[PDB]
Design an enzyme around this catalytic site. Structure first.
Site, PDB file in Angstrom:
ATOM      1  N   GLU A  35      39.985  37.683  32.855  1.00 13.26           N
ATOM      2  CA  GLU A  35      40.024  37.879  34.299  1.00 13.26           C
ATOM      3  C   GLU A  35      39.240  36.795  35.038  1.00 13.26           C
ATOM      4  O   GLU A  35      39.724  36.250  36.039  1.00 13.26           O
ATOM      5  CB  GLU A  35      39.478  39.260  34.654  1.00 13.26           C
ATOM      6  CG  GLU A  35      40.398  40.422  34.281  1.00 13.26           C
ATOM      7  CD  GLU A  35      41.699  40.436  35.074  1.00 13.26           C
ATOM      8  OE1 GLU A  35      41.874  39.605  35.992  1.00 13.26           O
ATOM      9  OE2 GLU A  35      42.564  41.276  34.749  1.00 13.26           O
ATOM     10  N   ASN A  46      45.879  37.411  45.654  1.00 13.25           N
ATOM     11  CA  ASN A  46      47.112  37.972  45.125  1.00 13.25           C
ATOM     12  C   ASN A  46      48.270  37.734  46.097  1.00 13.25           C
ATOM     13  O   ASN A  46      48.074  37.478  47.289  1.00 13.25           O
ATOM     14  CB  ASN A  46      46.942  39.473  44.869  1.00 13.25           C
ATOM     15  CG  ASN A  46      45.780  39.789  43.935  1.00 13.25           C
ATOM     16  OD1 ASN A  46      45.631  39.181  42.876  1.00 13.25           O
ATOM     17  ND2 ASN A  46      44.947  40.747  44.329  1.00 13.25           N
ATOM     18  N   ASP A  48      50.303  39.791  47.403  1.00 11.76           N
ATOM     19  CA  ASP A  48      50.424  40.775  48.472  1.00 11.76           C
ATOM     20  C   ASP A  48      49.361  40.602  49.549  1.00 11.76           C
ATOM     21  O   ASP A  48      49.335  41.388  50.503  1.00 11.76           O
ATOM     22  CB  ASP A  48      50.375  42.200  47.901  1.00 11.76           C
ATOM     23  CG  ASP A  48      49.019  42.567  47.318  1.00 11.76           C
ATOM     24  OD1 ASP A  48      48.083  41.746  47.368  1.00 11.76           O
ATOM     25  OD2 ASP A  48      48.884  43.700  46.808  1.00 11.76           O
ATOM     26  N   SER A  50      46.023  40.756  49.146  1.00 11.72           N
ATOM     27  CA  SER A  50      44.726  41.188  48.669  1.00 11.72           C
ATOM     28  C   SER A  50      44.087  40.071  47.850  1.00 11.72           C
ATOM     29  O   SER A  50      44.707  39.047  47.558  1.00 11.72           O
ATOM     30  CB  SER A  50      44.863  42.466  47.843  1.00 11.72           C
ATOM     31  OG  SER A  50      45.532  42.232  46.616  1.00 11.72           O
ATOM     32  N   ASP A  52      41.210  39.438  44.426  1.00 10.22           N
ATOM     33  CA  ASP A  52      40.458  39.966  43.293  1.00 10.22           C
ATOM     34  C   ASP A  52      39.091  39.294  43.240  1.00 10.22           C
ATOM     35  O   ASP A  52      38.995  38.073  43.392  1.00 10.22           O
ATOM     36  CB  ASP A  52      41.172  39.711  41.962  1.00 10.22           C
ATOM     37  CG  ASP A  52      42.420  40.547  41.779  1.00 10.22           C
ATOM     38  OD1 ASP A  52      42.665  41.473  42.577  1.00 10.22           O
ATOM     39  OD2 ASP A  52      43.155  40.278  40.803  1.00 10.22           O
ATOM     40  N   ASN A  59      40.182  44.477  42.884  1.00 16.39           N
ATOM     41  CA  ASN A  59      41.134  44.152  43.938  1.00 16.39           C
ATOM     42  C   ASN A  59      40.772  44.851  45.242  1.00 16.39           C
ATOM     43  O   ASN A  59      40.407  46.031  45.254  1.00 16.39           O
ATOM     44  CB  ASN A  59      42.549  44.551  43.508  1.00 16.39           C
ATOM     45  CG  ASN A  59      43.618  44.094  44.490  1.00 16.39           C
ATOM     46  OD1 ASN A  59      43.337  43.814  45.650  1.00 16.39           O
ATOM     47  ND2 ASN A  59      44.858  44.018  44.016  1.00 16.39           N
TER      48      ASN A  59
END
Ligand SMILES: [Cl-]
Ligand SMILES: [Cl-]
Ligand SMILES: [Cl-]
Ligand SMILES: [Cl-]
Ligand SMILES: [Cl-]
Ligand code: NA
Length: 129
Positions: A35, A46, A48, A50, A52, A59
């Site tokens: 990650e 991301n 969409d 959002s 992380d 998120n």
């Protein structure tokens, strides 16, 4: 902070992640490797909209507030920036909430695609824990 592998393993263990919801410590170290490459300051946007945040790439759609994810929630009740600290406490407490949800560690895409089913114990080999 860029953690060493065993350094992160010890910190995760002290904060009670080893076998939390049945996931052994190597699962969590493996997830953090893919990650964030063990970097507490990692951030990734991301598709969409959002973002992380942190060592476990938590998120903003559900778990923390960053003020720029319309319609999102803040279920760990924390600013997303708090998930970038060298002290992993906030990230660990929030990850416990995430993994307690219906899908377990499958919520971490990198865990599912790169750790799940593999010899995750290798990620703590050689560590004095
Ligand atoms: Cl927001
Ligand atoms: Cl820490
Ligand atoms: Cl599970
Ligand atoms: Cl891989
Ligand atoms: Cl393990
Ligand atoms: Na949010």
């Amino acid at each position: 902070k860029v953690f060493g592998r065993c350094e992160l393993a010890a910190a995760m263990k002290r904060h009670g992640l080893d076998n939390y919801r049945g996931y052994s410590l190597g699962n969590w170290v493996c997830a953090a490797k893919f990650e964030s490459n063990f970097n507490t300051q990692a951030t990734n946007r991301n598709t969409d909209g959002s973002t992380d945040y942190g060592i476990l790439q938590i998120n903003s759609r559900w778990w923390c507030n960053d003020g720029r994810t319309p319609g999102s929630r803040n279920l760990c009740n924390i600013p997303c920036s708090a998930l970038l600290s060298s002290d992993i406490t906030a990230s660990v407490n929030c990850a416990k909430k995430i993994v307690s949800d219906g899908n377990g560690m499958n919520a971490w895409v990198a865990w599912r695609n790169r750790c799940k089913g593999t010899d995750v114990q290798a990620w703590i080999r050689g560590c004095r824990l």
